[PDB]
Paper text:
SARS-CoV-2 utilizes a trimeric spike glycoprotein for attachment to the host cell receptor angiotensin-converting enzyme 2 (ACE2) and for the subsequent cell entry step which involves the fusion of host cell and viral membranes. Given its crucial role in the viral replicative cycle, the spike protein represents an important therapeutic target and is a critical antigen in host immune responses. All emerging variants contain defining mutations within their spike proteins, with multiple mutations clustering within the receptor-binding domain (RBD) impacting both ACE2 binding and antibody neutralization escape, while mutations within the highly antigenic loops in the N-terminal domain (NTD) across these variants reduce antibody neutralization. Given the rapidly changing mutational and antigenic landscape of the SARS-CoV-2 spike protein, a structural understanding of spike protein mutational effects and the discovery of broadly neutralizing epitopes is of importance.
To this aim, ectodomains bearing variant spike mutations were used for cryo-EM structural studies. Global 3D reconstructions were obtained at resolutions ranging from (2.25–2.5 Å), yielding open trimers with one RBD in the up conformation and 2 RBDs in the down conformation for all spikes. In contrast, we were able to confidently model sidechains close to, and within the S2 domain, owing to its limited flexibility. Additional mutations were visualized within the Beta and Gamma variant spike proteins, with implications for inter-protomer and intra-protomer contacts. The T1027I mutation lies within the Gamma spike S2 core and the bulky hydrophobic I1027 sidechain faces inwards, increasing the hydrophobicity of the local buried environment.
Author numbering:
A (entry chain A): 299 to 620, 641 to 675, 691 to 694
B (entry chain B): 14 to 69, 77 to 145, 153 to 176, 185 to 247, 257 to 298
C (entry chain C): 447 to 496
The structure:
């Protein structure tokens, strides 16, 4: 009271000195049910792959992009990214996801990079100069290695000109290295461009296959249909806590409500457009929002020339949330409610006054 | 399998008064015993709505622009109307939308297809006539849901496109009038948002053709036009819009 | 190639203004901890300039 009045002596009266505010206990974050996962089983963990020049483009759209399982799998040899944070993948949203898969050797993994000039990039799959996305690769010695020869997975060795970014070539024309006139007929200086790999059981590290599936992201003006996982924590009731109901953040007291929400309504507002009821997304229940018990704090004191005793009034606050009296003006602390009736000395409100005889109400 | 129709009779389209119909919930906010004023693209009260008929021999299959939002109502029985088309050019140049309701489910495919001049369906007296598009090239988005279906049931519909969010609204309204709208009030509850974000300028309705020559049923469907304006919506005790006021209709409502 | 200067590419938490971090310790970039030894999903916090 002295600090608020900016004086070392206080006259007799009632002074508001602060504001009482029931602080929140925990923070509650809840969201709708986590369903409809991205079908990455038939994309990253398929049975048969494709050649590097004929990479299979699969569209991963309108599904919650869970990246924890992809990132924490120990079967994937290396997780590498260039323009995105690997640990921020849960908080990101995209229009669509470009899931592309192919097969390359052990020393060809370095060629999967923006702007890298190798025997594969210039003729099978070429990346732009500002590429986005993380590349997942793994050693496939347990299944791809065959003694008879794994010649199914091919690779476009040569072509007339370098590839533009994100170009797929399915043609089978005859390469022309020299000036000899070829018309699709092989000869001394005319051979087929596509060749087989060299995956054999005898070969060790550096000569082993590496199945590479690459995820690419486009962030065009289309709405973010692809998004990351949401975490829905436990629900608290009858407690002043922070809450997050599908982005409706705030502080309040949640109780069971008899309000009959319509089957599409998620929020409820009063006359003054303040949210006073929310439909719980996980289990459809209506929760009334009651504001936490705030109110002014008034200090009832006689003059400091008389005594240093004070009584504290918590205006509009029920006594259970804060010589303890429940006045209609709020909870009163430090004043004993006598049954006598005197002239009003220090007004409290609603017919109750305070006086110094000890402070009495 | 595109097929022309050379048995068309010519007659001008009808007209009617929209009455106190076309009110939809602006958002998903519960409100009880409070009069909420909202600025949103609404169908004006007592507006001029274009009326199309089907009778047997008339056949009304127009391609009207979407403008900024189209109201759609259909006093109908026996499921003559079973879907809609949305898209600017409806050919192999620009992406289209496909809505088809049949015995399995409603189909919502966002695909760039080359539509016929007259797409249609078939009910031979069961559906066994799948002639809507003669070809199919690409698809980018696809959705699946549940079917929404003296005339008894009038199926109101309101469509919008804000930032590509293709909101679809509807309500099941019992009726008894064979031809004209009923006199009363009924708000339109939302169904689902469609955040597709592509170019939409025009739309088209798909009709189910009957066969006894091709037979035509007794159909009566409407195409209302939404306009930006302000409405005063009264909410009941239970949270439904039980009364509305068009602020720009006449001075008393203002 | 000058590789005498390095930058803190990865760090667990943000830095307050006018606060310097010299803790040359390992970064646990994966769910499985590095256990104080460099390995998969674990690299030196400072990367030399190329
Ligand atoms: C059905 O009729 C419409 C118009 O009556 C036909 O559309 C035109 O067809 C001719 C013939 O190929 C084209 O030259 C025109 O360019 C078409 N019009 C437009 C606006 O493109 C339609 O082809 C007919 N359907 C069938 C299957 O013949
Ligand atoms: C392959 O990856 C998918 C991705 O979730 C996973 O569900 C599946 O179990 C994996 N396959 C095997 C054999 O573990
Ligand atoms: C969502 O999760 C809750 C949590 O147990 C469950 O009770 C409910 O059945 C689930 N499904 C729907 C459609 O709410
Ligand atoms: C609606 O407009 C048309 C012309 O656009 C007109 O012929 C018709 O009479 C109008 N109807 C009403 C009810 O205003
Ligand atoms: C309904 O339409 C779908 C569209 O693909 C079709 O597959 C299905 O067979 C149709 N239903 C019947 C009963 O023919
Ligand atoms: C659309 O289809 C045509 C051929 O049907 C094809 O050439 C074109 O690349 C396709 N476009 C997209 C975006 O898929
Ligand atoms: C949408 O289509 C209309 C008419 O076809 C055209 O005027 C407009 O420029 C198009 N908008 C976009 C974004 O393609
Ligand atoms: C509101 O609900 C009560 C039952 O709780 C019902 O008797 C009454 O008819 C309803 N009113 C409206 C306008 O739907």
């Amino acid at each position: 009271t002295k600090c608020t009045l900016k004086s070392f002596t206080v006259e007799k009266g009632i002074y508001q000195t602060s504001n009482f505010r029931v602080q929140p206990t925990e923070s509650i974050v809840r969201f709708p049910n986590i369903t409809n996962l991205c079908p990455f089983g038939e994309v990253f963990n398929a049975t048969r792959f494709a050649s590097v020049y004929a990479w299979n483009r699969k569209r991963i759209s309108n599904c919650v992009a869970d990246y924890s399982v992809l990132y924490n799998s120990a079967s994937f040899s290396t997780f590498k990214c260039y323009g995105v944070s690997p640990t921020k993948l849960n908080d990101l949203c995209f229009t669509n996801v470009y899931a592309d898969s192919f097969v390359i050797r052990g020393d060809e993994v370095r060629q999967i990079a923006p702007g890298q000039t190798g025997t594969i990039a210039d003729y099978n799959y070429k990346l732009p100069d500002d590429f986005t996305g993380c590349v997942i690769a793994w050693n496939s010695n347990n299944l791809d290695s065959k003694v008879g020869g794994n010649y199914n997975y091919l690779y476009r060795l040569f072509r007339k000109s370098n590839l533009k970014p994100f170009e797929r070539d399915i043609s089978t024309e005859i390469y022309q290295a020299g000036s000899t006139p070829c018309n699709g007929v092989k000869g001394f200086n005319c051979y087929f461009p596509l060749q087989s790999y060299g995956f054999q059981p005898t070969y060790g590290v550096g000569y082993q296959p590496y199945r590479v599936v690459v995820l690419s992201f486009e962030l065009l003006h289309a709405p973010a249909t692809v998004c990351g996982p949401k975490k829905s924590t436990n629900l608290v009731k009858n407690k002043c806590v922070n809450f997050n109901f599908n982005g409706l953040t705030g502080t309040g007291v949640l109780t069971e409500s008899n309000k009959k929400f319509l089957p599409f309504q998620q929020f409820g507002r009063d006359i003054a457009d303040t949210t006073d009821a929310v439909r719980d997304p996980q289990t459809l229940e209506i929760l009334d929002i009651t504001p936490c018990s705030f109110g002014g704090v008034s200090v009832i004191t006689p003059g400091t020339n008389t005594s240093n005793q004070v009584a504290v009034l918590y205006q509009g606050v029920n006594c259970t949330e804060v010589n303890v009296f429940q006045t209609r003006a709020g909870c009163l602390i430090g004043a004993e409610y006598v049954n006598n009736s005197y002239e009003c000395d220090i007004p409290i409100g609603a017919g109750i006054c305070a006086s110094y005889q000890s402070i009495i109400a | 399998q595109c097929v022309n129709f050379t048995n068309r009779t010519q007659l001008p389209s009808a007209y009617t008064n929209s009455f106190t119909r076309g009110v939809y919930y602006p958002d998903k906010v519960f409100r009880s015993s409070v009069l909420h004023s909202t600025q949103d693209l609404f169908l004006p009260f007592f507006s001029n709505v274009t009326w199309f008929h089907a009778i047997h021999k008339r056949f009304d299959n127009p391609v009207l622009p979407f403008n900024d939002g189209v109201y759609f109502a259909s006093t109908e029985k026996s499921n003559i109307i079973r879907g809609w088309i949305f898209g600017t050019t409806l050919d192999s140049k620009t992406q289209s939308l496909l809505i088809v309701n049949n015995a399995t489910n409603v189909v919502i495919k966002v695909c760039e297809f080359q539509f016929c001049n007259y797409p249609f369906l078939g009910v031979y007296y069961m559906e066994s006539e799948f002639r809507v598009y003669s070809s199919a090239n690409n698809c980018t988005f696809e959705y699946v849901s549940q079917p929404f279906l003296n005339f008894k049931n009038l199926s109101e519909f309101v469509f919008k496109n804000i930032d590509g969010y293709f909101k679809i609204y509807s309500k099941h309204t019992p009726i008894n009038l064979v031809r004209d709208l009923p006199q009363g009030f009924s708000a339109l509850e939302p169904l689902v948002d469609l955040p597709i974000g592509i170019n939409i300028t025009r739309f088209q309705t798909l009709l189910a053709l009957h066969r006894s020559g091709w037979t035509a049923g007794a159909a009566a469907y409407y195409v209302g036009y939404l306009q930006p304006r302000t409405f005063l919506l009264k909410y009941n005790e239970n949270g439904t819009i039980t009364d509305a006021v068009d602020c720009a209709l006449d001075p008393l409502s203002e």
